[PDB]
Amino acid sequence: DALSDGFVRLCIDPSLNFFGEGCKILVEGQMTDDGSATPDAVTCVTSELDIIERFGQGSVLTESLRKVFCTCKSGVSVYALPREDASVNPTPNDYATVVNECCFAVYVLSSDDTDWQENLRDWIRSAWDCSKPQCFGHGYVFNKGTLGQVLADGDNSAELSRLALPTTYPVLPYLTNAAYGALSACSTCNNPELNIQGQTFGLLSCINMPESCTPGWTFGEVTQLQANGFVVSIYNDVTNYLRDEKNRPNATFRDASSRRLAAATGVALAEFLQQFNGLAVFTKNTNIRTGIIGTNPRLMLGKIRKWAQDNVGTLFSEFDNINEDIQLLTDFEVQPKCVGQPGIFHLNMRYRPPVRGARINVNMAPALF
Amino acid sequence: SVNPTPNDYATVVNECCFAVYVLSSDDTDWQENLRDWIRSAWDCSKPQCFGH
Amino acid sequence: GLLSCINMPESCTPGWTFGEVTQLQANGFVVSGSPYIYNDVTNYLRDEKNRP
Amino acid sequence: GLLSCINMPESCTPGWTFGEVTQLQANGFVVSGSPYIYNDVTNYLRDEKNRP
Amino acid sequence: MYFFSVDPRNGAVCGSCCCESISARPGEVNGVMVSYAAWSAPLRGHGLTNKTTFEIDGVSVTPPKVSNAFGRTKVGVVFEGTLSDLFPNPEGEQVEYEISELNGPSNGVVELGANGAFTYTPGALFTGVDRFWFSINGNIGEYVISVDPTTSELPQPPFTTPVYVPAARRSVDPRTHVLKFVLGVSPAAIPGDVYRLTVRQVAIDCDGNEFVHISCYDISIGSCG
Helix, strand or coil: CCCCCCCCCCCCCCCCCCCCCCCCCEEECCCCCCCCCCCCCEEEECCCCCCCCCCCCCHHHHHHHHHHHCCCCCCCCCCEEECCCCCCCCCCCCCCCCCCCCCCCEEECCCCCHHHHHHHHHHHHCCCCCCCCCCEEEEEEECCCCHHHHHHCCCCCCCCEEECCCCCCCCCCCHHHHHHHHHHHHHCCCCCCCCCCCCCCCCCCCCCCCCCCCCCCHHHHHHHHHHHHCCCCCCCCCCCCCCCCCCCHHHHEEEEEHHHHHHHHHHHHHHHHHHHCCCCCCCEEEEEEEECCEEEEHHHHHHHHHHHCCCCCCCCCCCCCCHHHCEEEEEEEEEECCCCCCCEEEECCCCCCCCCCCCCCCCCCCCCC | CCCCCCCCCCCCCCCCCCCCCCCCCCCCCHHHHHHHHCCCCCCCCCCCCCCC | CCCCCCCCCCCCCCCCHHHHHHHHHCCCCEEEEECECCCCCCCCCCCCCCCC | CCCCCCCCCCCCCCCHHHHHHHHHHHCCCCCCCEEEECCCCCCCCCCCCCCC | CCEEECCCCCCCCCCCCCCCCEEEECCCCEEEEEEEHHHHHHCCCECCCCCCEEEEEEECHHHHHHHEEECCCCCCCCEEEEECCCCCCCCCCCCCCCEHEEEEHCCEECCEEECEEEEEEECCCCCEEEEEEEECCCEEEEEEEEEECCCCCCCCCCCCCCCCCCCCCCCECCEEEEEEEEEEEEECCCCCCCEEEEEEEEEEEECCEEEEEEEEEEEEEECCC
């Protein structure tokens, strides 16, 4: 049939898949033993077919991943950590063993227990530490309760996006939470600049909440939540930071967009610097010979600056004083020469998220003629 | 009458492509066999001259 | 879509009523209400996973 | 590559089937399906020892 | 000769966790030098000491197919042995045996019979231990014989591990902060296996105190160089 020869070889399959998966969200939640699968074991689940008898029918995880499996149609690689059960809330979980170097971008924890949330926080912040192996993860957790409680039941962590919910919210909390994370991932896991807010870029699809008149957090409470932190719905996709080491105002690490772009710059500079391996870096005579591949610390700083002067506008913003924001000091330079050793260098930059749009106060004042 | 199951379908009909197939029977087994056969005119390990 | 060479006796209550008709259609089974055919589809309702 | 003067008697079953063909296509041979020729290679598979 | 440099512990090849890499071929006995010069020179003192400690762990082992066997013959007397009850040959397979001439005996000669039989004639006027390496259908194992000086007996030595570091062949150069040691690989090491060697070297200050340092290297048993 003109296909006998052997040149073309066609497979007409409806359920094909070409996408380069990426986008490796993890979902954590308690389970019912109906799910035939080893607990405390990361399982990169497929689409629905391998369902409730894989994680536990009925239990929170079921609905959570259902919403997640929902939302995003294509783009993510869903991962599940089906924790087991036991004022009960069996949450204990110091488990950097089961989940390890294999790194996940988005995290969603369907449990209002402060301890579990804080443990996830610690794990993420550990991943986000100066330690040379990096993957730059981010989590999403929910938090119900009254205004006083919501405020009190919080922290400084900027590695989560703790969602606030009034004690009237019809939908079961964790549900929305999952959806939120889901959307974010599948949306931003290629473009980090995007920010999930407004109506078009962020409306949770799988919610279908019953409409009413009395919304929830009144305007005052809305301001309280927003300023303080939480991502009251969606609008204001910030990460509760509100502070810093000592001085409170640290606008930089407020938006999630800022955090994703910072991770992007980190991985870009990491995959870029690797062209300075081998090389040979003269540091005493600062005079490379003729015919030998080599570089000098000053030359390296020049290269770094040139680089940081191209990604500007797209990753960084303006670099006010380039002469000071980017500094490269050699081991021998800082340390008075007794404890110096060629090979060690110190680079320090100044991240400035590209300024975005915000409120536009209007003061239209009518008159006649 | 225990109707026959002419399962084989390999040698009976080799790669001789037919657009339409007309099975005249109610034997679920016979139907399943014809189904499997036609599920070979749409595989990968063949020139796949199809037919429904 | 007409099966002209059939010539079945006459209508009293043709086979499946509206409900059953719609049920089988949803289940992917062509219904023939001289009986004209309609929904000339095949018995395909789901892939490895995807139902719709 | 269509051998003109063979006028083979049209049939409905080949000799080498897909399997054994795929088999001796890795092994260099000149399998012929009138009958046309394809995979016009030589019986060369390996230099002194490094087969690929 | 492998030559590695230690990190001077300033938080300044992580690979998988930290440990370095060392390729190795089955049967070889190579040498490694590690330079603590970067770590012990700023700590102006009396250099290193001869108190290294080595530890071998396997992260990929591929449990052996054939098994080993012992022997306790006497001096001058011929020894007889079999080689059929070693390979469990689970699935019906030819039991073709072989004694590689590269790893034959050390003070004797074997006589491989027709069916896994072998006759070991120890060297006249010799009392001690001897080994040889057989290959039962591609899979390699060792046979150890202890020739006894006709008085009573001789103790039992330990069957050599696939990857090892000799008992006393390590050295330290306090004038250059260099540790020398040897890496021995058994011919029974299966290619593809991966072992981990961890070292704990102690330097010393001018007053007699200690400074500990710990590192690893991942030894990859690879075939064909």
